[PDB]
Amino acid sequence: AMEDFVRQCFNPMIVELAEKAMKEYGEDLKIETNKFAAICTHLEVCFMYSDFHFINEQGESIVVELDDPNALKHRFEIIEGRDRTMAWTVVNSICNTTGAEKPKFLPDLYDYKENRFIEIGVTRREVHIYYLEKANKIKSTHIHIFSFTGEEMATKADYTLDEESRARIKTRLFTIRQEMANRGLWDSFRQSER
Ligand SMILES: [Mn+2]
Ligand SMILES: [Mn+2]
């Protein structure tokens, strides 16, 4: 039921990137079907946060630019979603160009406005738990956590984005949760986080 849900309710490129991720790090999506949904969600939130466009101005899909980019153009640079070697190449170029501090951990985004890397997380539990889990390792890089029920927690209470873009992420999370609950999948998905 959950695998069917994911494939019907996330966009095809998101599902492709998630399946790729699971094939690579050795997770079987037939077994870890809740984690498959969680990887899809995490990817979608990061792409939405960055305002990344998967179709170019000439009307063509450009998924290839995650693993083989051209120039490094907008307020946010995506780091999540890329091949790990290429993600580190992007982080290094960024630090070279901006003089920003090179993080010890691979972050999700670079913010050229605030000159910091951002670490994104999505939780089905009380937001502070996953915030602290992340923050007690991560020691520099800005953290922004979203829960499915609309709470957020961020470093210094600085949410980076405007109220409207944040609301778009929250809305999408509420819709996912809702549709899972309709299919009887939410309770298992929530419980599997612990
Ligand atoms: Mn990440
Ligand atoms: Mn992250």
Swiss-Prot record:
Residues reported to bind Mn(2+) 2: E80, D108
Protein's GO biological process: cap snatching; DNA-templated transcription; symbiont-mediated suppression of host gene expression; symbiont-mediated suppression of host mRNA transcription via inhibition of RNA polymerase II activity; viral RNA genome replication; viral translational frameshifting
Chain positions of motif Nuclear localization signal 1 (NLS1): 124-139
Ligand binding (Mn(2+) 1): H42, D108, E119, I120
One MF term in the entry's GO annotations: metal ion binding
Disulfide bridge map: none
Keywords: Cap snatching, Endonuclease, Eukaryotic host gene expression shutoff by virus, Eukaryotic host transcription shutoff by virus, Host cytoplasm, Host gene expression shutoff by virus, Host nucleus, Host-virus interaction, Hydrolase, Inhibition of host RNA polymerase II by virus, Manganese, Metal-binding, Nuclease, Phosphoprotein
Keyword Hydrolase tagged: yes
Subcellular locations according to the entry: Host cytoplasm; Host nucleus
The keyword Metal-binding is assigned to this record: yes
Gene Ontology CC: one annotated term: host cell nucleus
Record PTM: Phosphorylated on serines and threonines by host kinases, including human casein kinase II.
Its job: Plays an essential role in viral RNA transcription and replication by forming the heterotrimeric polymerase complex together with PB1 and PB2 subunits. The complex transcribes viral mRNAs by using a unique mechanism called cap-snatching. It consists in the hijacking and cleavage of host capped pre-mRNAs. These short capped RNAs are then used as primers for viral mRNAs. The PB2 subunit is responsible for the binding of the 5' cap of cellular pre-mRNAs which are subsequently cleaved after 10-13 nucleotides by the PA subunit that carries the endonuclease activity.
Quaternary structure and partners: Influenza RNA polymerase is composed of three subunits: PB1, PB2 and PA. Interacts (via C-terminus) with PB1 (via N-terminus).
Family: Belongs to the influenza viruses PA family.
Protein name: Polymerase acidic protein
Organism: Influenza A virus (strain A/Victoria/3/1975 H3N2)
Portion of the full-length sequence here: 1 to 196 of 716
